């Protein structure tokens, strides 16, 4: 649905059926609530335990088509510009894309061959580095996060005697804001995520109705509810 359609259907669901019988809502507030709603739906439908069906990203076709228009494949760039300090001796620091929301598949192309990357935990690192060999398996590579400055930097711990030629990242792109009107017209200086103009939803139409309903519930809780409503509806914010 278009942003105008978003606003009109939002005023048909909230505001009763366009009766002007509930707290009047501005376009900036509607844009804010729609943005919050789309982040909430993304975070709830990625994590299987956040929704009611118990299904995550690729557990059903519906979730696949939901997250389809956010999947992005990008290459990581070497962070040799900054001579920072690494935690591991054989770690090549790489910078991830800026519009990164969630990583789901990462791979590295070495001289030996392509090796799928395994995100290792802080405990698994200590467990596997207390052994004789202290290297990954033949067909995998390790990755841990390190010092990052207004970005995401990752330590690529690949087996020694090898070189890294490419670092591909299939990640969920950060959703763009949902803005119904140019906010600079009526309002002095207000933004949603650094944007002031109209911003169409960069998602599949599948979850647009869900976003609208979640925004309606958020508006109802905030503008017609008490502390209990806010606390109860903040549970579904993660």
């Amino acid at each position: 649905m278009n942003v105008n359609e978003f606003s009109n259907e939002f005023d048909v669901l909230y505001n009763n059926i366009m009766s002007n019988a509930a707290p009047g809502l501005n376009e900036y507030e509607k844009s804010v609530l729609l943005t919050k709603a789309q982040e909430e739906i993304v975070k709830n439908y990625f994590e299987p335990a956040g929704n009611k069906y118990g299904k995550g990203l690729d557990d059903s076709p519906k979730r696949q088509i939901d997250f389809s228009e956010l999947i992005k494949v990008g290459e990581g760039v070497l962070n040799t510009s900054a001579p920072t300090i690494t935690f591991d001796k054989r770690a090549k620091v790489y910078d991830l894309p800026a519009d990164l929301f969630l990583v789901i598949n990462e791979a590295v192309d070495t001289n030996a061959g392509t090796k799928q990357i395994v995100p290792i935990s802080y405990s698994d690192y200590t467990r596997l580095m207390s052994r004789p060999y202290k290297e990954p398996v033949k067909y995998q590579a390790w990755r841990i996060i390190t010092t990052s400055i207004n970005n995401i930097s990752v330590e690529l711990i690949v087996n020694s005697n090898e070189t890294i030629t490419d670092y591909k990242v299939r990640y969920i792109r950060r959703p763009a804001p949902i803005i119904t009107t140019n906010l600079s017209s009526e309002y002095g200086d207000v933004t949603i995520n650094g944007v002031s103009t109209v911003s169409e939803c960069e998602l599949n139409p599948i979850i647009h109705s869900e976003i609208l309903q979640r925004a309606v519930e958020l508006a109802k809780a905030a503008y017609q509810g008490d502390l209990q409503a806010s606390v109860e509806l903040g549970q579904r914010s993660e």
């Binding site: 002007n20 019988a21 509930a22 707290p23 009047g24 503008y223």
Partner: protein
């Protein structure tokens, strides 16, 4: 005068309560009503509708 109420302005006699509504002496004047909304005045309210 008789059973009718009359007025005099600008050199002419205007019969009142006989013409079209809100037109006084040929000019349109508005009507308005102001009423204070003070219920539970010790509490801070947001006026919504």
């Amino acid at each position: 005068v008789s059973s009718e109420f009359y007025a005099f302005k600008d050199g002419k006699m205007w019969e009142q309560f006989a013409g079209d509504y809100n037109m006084f002496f040929g000019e349109y004047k508005p009507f308005s009503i102001t009423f204070v909304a003070n219920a539970e005045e010790p509490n801070d309210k947001i006026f919504n509708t």
